[PDB]
RNA sequence: CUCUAGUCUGUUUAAAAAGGCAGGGAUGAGCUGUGAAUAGGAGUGAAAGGCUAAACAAACUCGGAGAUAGCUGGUUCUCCCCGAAAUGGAUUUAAGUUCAGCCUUAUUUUAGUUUAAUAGAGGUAGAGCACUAAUUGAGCUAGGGCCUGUCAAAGGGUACCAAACUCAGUUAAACUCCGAAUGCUAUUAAAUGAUGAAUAGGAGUGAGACUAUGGGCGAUAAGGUUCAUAGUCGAGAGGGAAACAACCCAGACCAACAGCUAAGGUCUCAAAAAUGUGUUAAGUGGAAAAGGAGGUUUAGGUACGUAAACAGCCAGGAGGUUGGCUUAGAAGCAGCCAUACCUUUAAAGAGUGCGUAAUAGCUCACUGGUCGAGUACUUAAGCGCCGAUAAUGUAACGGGGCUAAAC
RNA sequence: GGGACUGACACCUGCCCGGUGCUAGUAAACGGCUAAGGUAGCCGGGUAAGUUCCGACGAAUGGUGUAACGAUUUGGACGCUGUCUCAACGUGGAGCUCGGUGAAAUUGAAGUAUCGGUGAAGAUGCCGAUUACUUGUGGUUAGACGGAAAGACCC
RNA sequence: GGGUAGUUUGACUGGGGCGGUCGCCUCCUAAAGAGUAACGGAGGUGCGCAAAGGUUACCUUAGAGUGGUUGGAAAUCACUCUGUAAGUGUAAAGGCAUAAGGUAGCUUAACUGUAAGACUGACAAGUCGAACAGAUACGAAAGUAGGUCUUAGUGAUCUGGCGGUGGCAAGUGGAAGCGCCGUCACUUAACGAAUAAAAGGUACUCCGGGGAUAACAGGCUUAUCCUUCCCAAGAGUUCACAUCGACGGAAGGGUUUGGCACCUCGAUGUCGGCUCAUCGCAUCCUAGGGCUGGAGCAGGUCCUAAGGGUAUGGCUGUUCGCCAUUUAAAGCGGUACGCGAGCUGGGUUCAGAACGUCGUGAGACAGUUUGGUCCCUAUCUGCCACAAGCGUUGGAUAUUUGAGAG
């Protein structure tokens, strides 16, 4: 079987083998994060949940500007426009909880 | 054949052709059209093969409009050469078509005969097609 | 049958050197260009090769009038 | 006694060039013993770049000499901290070397970078025809040609070849009347803590590769060549993709028979799942095109109907009129014109097919009964079928197997 | 006497002085044939079936013939045969067993199976699957990109 | 004056060579700062100008339409519409209505000493520059003028020559010579230039290395090649599809010729032949069918099917091809274009010699002819055979059912 086709096929099968349950969990997390970001002037706790390896250079710089270097990083920040923009950039790699 | 009679530059770079059609996508001069369902290149010579098919099927009933003109050189290096010198030479002419280009238009004949003739034309083109009546008149 | 051509000059690095709103002091080069792509306004001068330079310290500004762009120091 | 064509053994042989068979010369340009002469950029050569102490396109020994090599190989005990480049410029350069960039040590110095707000310049994508070009159907019309009461004068018909003009619709990296999204640059406020800069000391690198995008070249072929952004490997262990440096997850100070998770899975091999609602009969899942196609789920149109729709069955399916002909013959069926032929009209086409030299004949469309409501043609979405096809052995779920343990 | 050229013998050996050698000339000089354009000469048969063979470039770096000669090359005929269809048997030296003596090259090791795949892109070492009691000897090399020669070809 | 000696004769290159190219400028490629490769796609250039420079003043084309001796479509002139498409020494781009376009007058700033502050940049270099002093030119003056509307028209250092200045003057004083300032002489075009001064062959070759780089194969792709399929205008008396199926379209096979240069140059031995096979089916024949414009016979086309078989000679090294007899039929491919640690060396691919052609020659030529070493005792795996030990559950001796295999 030709190598071009088998490489395409192997990649397509790997991509398509994602679980809808995991996708639903991710969607729920994204909705929660957007709901929190929609607020204004609250103290929010930011957890880093996805690694920095392999991500874009710009986004690694944004995360290090937020203060998160590892998974399991905990930082409290006051939501103004700057922090809101950074969180929007890196929404897919963070978990936002609110500090009552 | 169908081919431009004068060009500024003999050879041009093969772009990437993509996206649907945003223009030339509506029936203008006729009654029935042969839209494409793909994005690809239609050579001049396939164009004239489809034109013969339509015209010959139509016993003087109506008119045929060709909505594409090739105007794009297709170069090919000589048969047995290596990758060295550069930009070999024009071989034949291509026209660009995108998903939604009308590509062919017919007037005069009954709808059944037009549909037959225009499937007869679609049998000779390299893209999936669809036969469309005006969908806003009858 | 080799290539008949393949010949290019050195890139001349034209363009705007100080962005609108930046602070410059006297004599700065603002634009390098062939021809008055940008014309001269208040407090700037034009070199023999249409370079735009600042006659005094200030802040660069670009204005548009009848579709032509003018550079000034304010 | 001197030589070796041909063939064979031998070829880690008995021999670092023989032997076993054979052949040539064999009173002569003959063989041979014993002495002597010609030595290295020279000698000798009945002449093959031969020989000259088993090796000669310039012998051997010693010395210069440890000659020079951008070439290859090798370079030995341990720990801690920081951490590349494979780019640019130049080169008798392309396997080298040098400068910059990148790295490290020490001192001094303090504002990288990421946003938000605000303020700036584009011509890219896209779009478009005002400009430069390509180009389609109509309207209009010069001009040119043809024809026509034309001598080559002054005239007309324009089937055309057609500038320009009007309407409508299209192509362009080297067309742009317009123009993003990002990126780039400046200022301020937050946020992030030695990531910036300078000097001094010391290198190494100057062969990249792949993937996700934007490209050029090639053949919108190549693990191909060459650029731009980012990541990875390079220099990165571990988990996953059956195996599989570049893909996905994830940065290893050490120890532990602790817990929660990512990617990826939960029938078993092999640590992990069940319930609900649909689809799938093809093991599809568990490769792939155009196309063919009463597969089926669901949804939406057009034909059509309880006043008798479709299918089947029982009848009619006509005459004027070989429709006019072409042709040798066309009577509905070599072929041409149309069926602007009406009529008794149930309903009957200037006849649907088969077969007849031409007819005949057998049937169809159409219509009436019987029976009794969906039928007849398309469109949208989800799974399917054929298409589907190479050579050591089932070999395109990892395998067992699975109708869900598929989706 | 020295050098060059040709090469028994037979018939012939023509044209050109621009260029380059030699002392305007010289071609039996280097060479050419505008300085001068080359003179002489150089399908048939064989076989049932024949890309072979036989018969119809160039003139002293020589052209065309030639008796005799040749461990020269090629074709055909006769005779003869294990060359072949087609091999079998026998003989002699090895090989085989035992006794004595006793190597070599190679060598990271090894309780080293195969197939289908993947992979520095031809797998003994990986994945899946299949096969296989343990260990020798006599045979044969398919592999271990075998050993031997820092490939002689290319750059 | 190759008799002899010392040396040179480049690099890039989708191997190398041949060919082409080497500086600089304009546009695109270039993905909207800048920058950004190619043997990517298009052009120009190693100048010209004493005005085509500077300054002041004054003016605007090209095209369409209309009217006029030559004069016509178009020469010159008038007007309407159009508003830069005209024109800017020279290529193109960016610009130029205040025109940088055109005309006229004056004139030489086509200056000297200089320069705050910058762009571009490895460096060396290159470019812009307000403003200051002297001397002007033009204008009434303010101001402008340090060449050309801008962007190519160019060349370092060393050496040498000319002019000016008068610093250096080997005991002193002169002088030679040199420094300083001005400045000329390099197709050094291989243009950041190794010498003031330079061509080829090596198949007699040699050395140091490279799969960083070719040829035989492996691997990738499928242009090409081959095998199909989709549409059916027709031919076939009429009858698109018995058959052939015109012009096109969509794919497979990875065997031909190629691309690419990924494995390999401290060696993967290259074409045929002989011996020995094995596998695929896209089936040459034998077998089982469908349809024919299939009467029978003999076929044609199509489907299924690889169990077996699939020839001997003349020519050629030959694969292939041709030819003669045959046979029911004399298939197509893969396996390092099967098989040289099995054989053969005819050819290819060494050193001899001759011929043809090219080069002055040395020599070169997938032009021709002849001669011209094929090494190795099998360690493992694999296979063809025979045994030793052991198990099969008490130990042995015989007869056999049978998985499985040939």
């Amino acid at each position: 079987i030709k190598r071009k086709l088998r490489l395409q096929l192997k990649k397509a099968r790997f991509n398509a083998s994602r679980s809808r349950s995991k996708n639903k969990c991710f969607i729920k997390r994204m909705e929660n994060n957007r709901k929190i970001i929609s607020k204004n002037n609250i103290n929010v706790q930011v957890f880093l949940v996805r690694s920095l390896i392999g991500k874009l250079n710009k986004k690694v710089k944004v995360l290090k500007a937020l203060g998160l270097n590892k998974i399991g990083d905990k930082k409290v920040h006051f939501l103004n426009e700057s922090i809101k923009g950074m969180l929007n950039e890196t929404i897919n790699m963070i978990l936002l909880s609110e500090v009552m | 054949m169908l081919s431009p009679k004068k060009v500024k530059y003999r050879k041009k770079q093969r772009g990437r052709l993509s996206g649907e059609a945003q223009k030339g996508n509506k029936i203008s001069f006729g009654e029935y059209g042969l839209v494409s369902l793909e994005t690809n290149f239609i050579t001049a010579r396939q164009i004239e093969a489809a034109r013969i098919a339509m015209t010959r099927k139509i016993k003087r009933g109506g008119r045929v409009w060709i909505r594409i003109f090739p105007d794009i050189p297709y170069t090919k290096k000589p048969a047995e050469t290596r990758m060295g010198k550069g930009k070999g030479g024009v071989d034949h002419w291509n026209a660009p078509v995108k998903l939604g280009t009308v590509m062919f238009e017919m007037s005069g004949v009954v709808e059944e005969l037009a549909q037959e003739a225009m499937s007869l034309a679609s049998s000779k083109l390299p893209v999936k097609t669809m036969f469309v009546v005006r969908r806003d008149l009858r | 049958g080799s290539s008949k051509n393949g010949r290019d000059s050195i890139s001349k690095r034209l363009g705007v050197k100080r962005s609108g709103g930046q602070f410059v002091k006297a004599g700065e080069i603002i634009v390098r260009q062939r021809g008055t792509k940008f014309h001269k306004g208040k407090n700037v001068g034009l070199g023999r090769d249409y370079t735009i330079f600042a006659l005094s310290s200030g802040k660069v500004e670009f204005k548009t009038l009848k579709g032509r762009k003018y550079v000034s120091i304010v």
Side-chain angles (χ1 to χ4, degrees):
Chain A
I1 78 173
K2 303 197 174 318
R3 197 180 174 271
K4 195 189 176 186
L5 258 64
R6 70 169 281 267
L7 287 201
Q8 308 182 3
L9 214 50
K10 172 180 195 167
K11 189 183 290 183
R13 296 206 171 124
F14 195 77
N15 285 344
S17 89
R18 187 84 208 286
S19 296
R20 177 67 178 177
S21 76
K22 297 283 189 50
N23 275 359
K24 275 206 75 68
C25 292
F26 165 80
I27 289 180
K28 187 185 312 302
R29 182 161 62 84
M30 290 284 117
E31 300 183 35
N32 168 35
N33 277 5
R34 254 186 297 286
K35 186 174 70 37
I36 301 299
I37 300 168
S38 84
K39 281 189 175 46
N40 199 324
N41 303 327
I42 302 97
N43 272 260
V44 57
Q45 193 179 16
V46 190
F47 297 82
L48 187 69
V49 304
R50 286 211 56 187
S51 163
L52 307 196
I53 298 155
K55 307 310 179 306
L56 264 68
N57 188 30
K58 153 178 52 192
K59 294 199 162 172
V60 169
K61 286 198 266 215
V62 183
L63 291 174
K64 272 177 175 302
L66 271 163
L68 313 162
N69 307 291
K70 316 186 170 302
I71 304 191
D73 266 333
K74 318 266 182 287
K75 286 216 82 68
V76 288
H77 283 340
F78 175 77
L79 278 177
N80 67 80
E81 293 314 317
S82 309
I83 310 285
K84 186 172 304 183
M86 286 192 245
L87 296 198
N88 276 335
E89 288 300 322
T90 78
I91 188 171
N92 74 305
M93 316 177 49
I94 50 160
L95 180 65
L96 301 186
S97 166
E98 189 178 14
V99 176
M100 283 75 73
Chain B
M1 288 303 170
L2 210 49
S3 166
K5 63 188 191 293
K6 183 187 313 307
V7 290
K8 277 210 286 198
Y9 303 123
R10 293 174 299 113
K11 321 172 181 180
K12 64 166 70 168
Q13 325 175 3
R14 43 189 69 111
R16 301 294 99 192
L17 195 46
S18 79
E20 292 84 3
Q22 313 294 329
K23 39 181 181 158
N25 57 3
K26 302 201 287 208
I27 278 156
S28 293
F29 299 148
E31 289 96 298
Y32 320 101
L34 184 59
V35 184
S36 64
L37 280 293
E38 305 200 359
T39 174
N40 217 335
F41 290 108
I42 308 292
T43 77
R45 193 181 191 271
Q46 312 165 342
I47 285 176
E48 61 86 20
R51 185 202 67 86
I52 306 147
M54 296 193 223
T55 298
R56 195 142 33 103
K57 181 64 167 178
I58 301 299
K59 299 288 94 176
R60 306 182 185 269
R63 314 167 43 69
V64 182
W65 282 275
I66 303 168
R67 295 282 301 285
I68 41 184
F69 189 92
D71 67 63
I72 287 192
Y74 176 104
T75 69
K76 202 168 187 169
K77 265 189 168 302
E80 187 65 22
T81 55
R82 293 191 164 173
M83 298 298 293
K85 316 307 188 55
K87 217 57 173 178
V90 56
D91 181 351
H92 65 102
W93 302 78
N94 295 98
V97 301
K98 317 179 83 179
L99 181 143
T101 301
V102 162
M103 187 181 287
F104 271 123
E105 192 169 357
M106 189 181 285
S107 78
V109 298
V110 69
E111 168 179 333
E112 300 289 332
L113 189 47
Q115 182 168 233
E116 182 64 26
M118 264 181 55
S119 84
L120 203 69
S122 158
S123 67
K124 320 216 167 294
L125 301 175
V127 289
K128 291 228 202 198
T129 62
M130 202 160 36
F131 170 93
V132 288
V133 194
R134 291 181 181 176
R135 294 285 72 81
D136 294 317
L137 274 302
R138 61 254 183 196
Chain C
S2 309
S3 165
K4 189 59 69 184
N5 47 23
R7 260 171 276 102
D8 203 16
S9 61
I10 295 185
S11 304
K12 287 306 177 315
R13 275 97 173 150
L14 313 173
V16 175
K17 295 302 157 183
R18 251 55 165 172
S19 62
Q22 197 174 3
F23 166 82
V24 304
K25 49 185 194 289
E28 292 277 59
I29 295 174
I30 291 168
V31 187
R32 308 222 75 151
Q33 41 181 27
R34 283 86 171 93
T36 59
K37 200 163 159 181
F38 304 95
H39 292 251
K40 53 185 287 298
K42 170 174 183 64
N43 283 356
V44 303
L46 196 72
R48 69 170 294 276
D49 64 0
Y50 301 115
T51 311
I52 310 276
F53 60 97
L55 299 188
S56 48
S57 181
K59 277 192 205 318
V60 172
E61 74 156 48
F62 292 77
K63 289 267 300 187
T64 315
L65 290 169
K66 294 272 166 198
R68 307 271 202 79
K69 293 265 205 292
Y70 289 85
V71 190
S72 314
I73 294 278
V74 297

